[PDB]
Amino acid sequence: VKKGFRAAFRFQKELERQRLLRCPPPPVRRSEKPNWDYHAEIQAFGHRLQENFSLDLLKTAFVNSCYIKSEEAKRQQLGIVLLNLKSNQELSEQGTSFSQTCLTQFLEDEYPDMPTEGIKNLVDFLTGEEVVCHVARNLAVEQLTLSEEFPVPPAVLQQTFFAVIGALLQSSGPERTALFIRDFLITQMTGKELFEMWKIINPMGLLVEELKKRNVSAPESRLTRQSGGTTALPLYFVGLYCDKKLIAEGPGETVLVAEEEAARVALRKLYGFTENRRPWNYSKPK
Amino acid sequence: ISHGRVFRRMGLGPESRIHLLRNLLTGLVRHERIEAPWARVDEMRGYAEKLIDYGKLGDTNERAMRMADFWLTEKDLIPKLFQVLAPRYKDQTGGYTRMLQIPNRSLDRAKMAVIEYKGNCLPPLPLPRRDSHLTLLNQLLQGLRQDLRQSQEA
């Protein structure tokens, strides 16, 4: 038994760390953790985004329907009106409706050649749960969200995020809110491809219909390049020709796959979603 | 190079091998069922078959009596050989003994076998029996056998 206290104390902390790794505690709300002031965090939420939020509207944005019902249930259990708390359903509807119209306006102006089917899917992608929740979690919306179940369900978190936009819509107006949507939802299409966001089936069939609307003859598929045809690792470049003029070309391991890829390349050029297209202009409007 | 060697190497030498088999053979005649290591029983089995052949020569044969005198260390078994075992197999030209393998010995995990003279008074060994003729495979072959005999007569 060696004399001392610091070495024993230091080893105890190491054992505590190992015990946490072996049996991780369940995640809990940041509000339940120490060093939390909800009023202070609400004000900093607006200041980080450089937006002049209204405190009355912003607080109601994070109040969900499930939280209100759970709060009412707890009062009944304890036998304890003062609970006239307004939910975020009204703000979310305003926020969701404005966001879809704002995103549609941005995409129509940026890609006039894109049909309404393509624009709708892009708007649905940007407003989808996967994209919205990823933005909401990294903007500290989840911490301020008042929900019955933790972690906040993606359906509930998405409703909360659009409630914040709805609260910002009344606080600042449509012109200021459009920049907020542009700075956080439009940016999500940075490296994403057109068909990585707009999933389609049988692109060749859709390509033929587009050319008919443009009074262009049906494309002809021909092999422009070929390598290792009889081997297990082939390469094929199928080119689409309209009136014996090349419109697109695509590689693939098989003729069928390469031909399908060429149709996708043709659709990207027609719709303006080329990889080397003009980048989005994030500069301040003149 | 043990090509063509039919005799095992057991005991302390050639003479010790005979004495070891003789003690097993003497025990086999008295009890008509003994158990021993499989190799020793298999080696002794050949001598047990030929001992009965000497018994069929009769006690009046000097050579048979001398052979029975040597291989039966207990002299009360000599009358038994010529008057019990030999008359028992009068109508048999061979197959006097049956050798079966029993589970390994508990001590040294040695391969053990049981050898007995057929027709003894002791309770029968659990002899292995082939599948019954009423099984699915045997019924199909029986039907095939009947078909061939019918065609042969026709």
């Binding site: - | 599948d131 019954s132 009423l134 699915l136 199909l140 029986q142 009947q146 078909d147």
Partner: protein, 294 residues
């Protein structure tokens, strides 16, 4: 009328409807005492659930050897399917292929492979041709093969399957063996059976014949996968029991004037009694010869 794909779906729903109907008749989980009267492990008593537990579940209490070796069960001196739920306290005995007198087991295996072949025949021909299963004749095992009476479309009147066609049936049957589908048995009233097989004239006559013999007019229905057929008696538990299976030949029964009845034939052996390559060829030759029930 109904398409062949829809015809199976209607039968399965009716089959499951009756099966769940019989399940609800059981009040809670009533206990039954099943006494083991077999040679091995004598005096064993199984406290099983009425109308739920099966003789296979009783075998699971003993060991894995009972589960693998037992092919048919003997309940109160009567043959009983391994997966047929027990309905009352009784005495149970397990039968194997290697018994002294495995007469009941041989009948069950032959009645089971005939059903397997019947499933192959129905799904083998194209949708253009119509296939109607008649029955599974009860031929002795010593006859060398099991047979199944099948009536095809009038178009296939002058057509005889080739050697490759026979090998096609064998591959389909081996696929059924690979699936390892247990034989599900269900005893229903005659009225329920007629509704299931109302689209086939031959089955209706067959069901009526079985119902007439029994005073209560109850028939036995067996199913593997999606194929439902009426069987003359108990069957083997699972299709995995069969190891060597082959369709030998097809013969046209006489007289052909009323209708052309084709008798598919084949020979099979279980895993426990698999034969050598040389011997199996000899049994194939005998199975190709036409067999006449007596």
């Amino acid at each position: 009328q109904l398409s062949p794909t829809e015809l199976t779906e209607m039968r399965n729903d009716l089959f499951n409807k009756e099966k769940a109907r019989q399940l609800s008749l059981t009040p809670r989980t009533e206990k039954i005492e099943v006494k083991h009267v077999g040679k091995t492990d004598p005096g064993t008593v199984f406290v099983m659930n009425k109308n739920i537990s099966t003789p296979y579940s009783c075998a699971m209490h003993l060991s894995e050897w009972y589960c693998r070796k037992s092919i048919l069960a003997l309940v109160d001196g009567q043959p009983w399917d391994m997966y047929k739920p027990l309905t009352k306290s009784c005495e149970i005995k397990f039968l194997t292929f290697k018994d002294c007198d495995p007469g009941e087991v041989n009948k069950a295996y032959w009645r089971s492979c005939a059903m397997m072949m019947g499933c192959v025949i129905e799904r083998a021909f194209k949708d253009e041709y119509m296939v109607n299963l008649v029955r599974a004749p009860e031929v002795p095992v010593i006859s060398g093969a099991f047979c199944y009476d099948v009536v095809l479309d009038s178009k296939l009147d002058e057509w005889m399957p080739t050697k490759e066609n026979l090998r096609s049936f064998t591959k389909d049957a081996h696929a059924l063996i690979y699936k390892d589908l247990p034989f599900e048995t269900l005893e229903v009233e005659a009225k329920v059976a007629l509704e299931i097989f109302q689209h086939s004239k031959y089955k209706v006559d067959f069901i009526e014949e079985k119902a007439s013999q029994n005073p209560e007019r109850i028939v036995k229905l067996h199913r593997i996968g999606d194929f439902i057929d009426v069987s003359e008696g108990p069957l083997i538990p699972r299709t995995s029991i069969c190891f060597q299976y082959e369709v030998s030949a097809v013969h046209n029964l006489q007289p052909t004037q009323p209708s052309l009845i084709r008798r598919f034939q084949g020979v099979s052996l279980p895993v426990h009694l698999r034969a050598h390559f040389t011997i199996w060829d000899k049994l194939l030759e005998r199975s190709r010869k036409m067999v006449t029930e007596d």
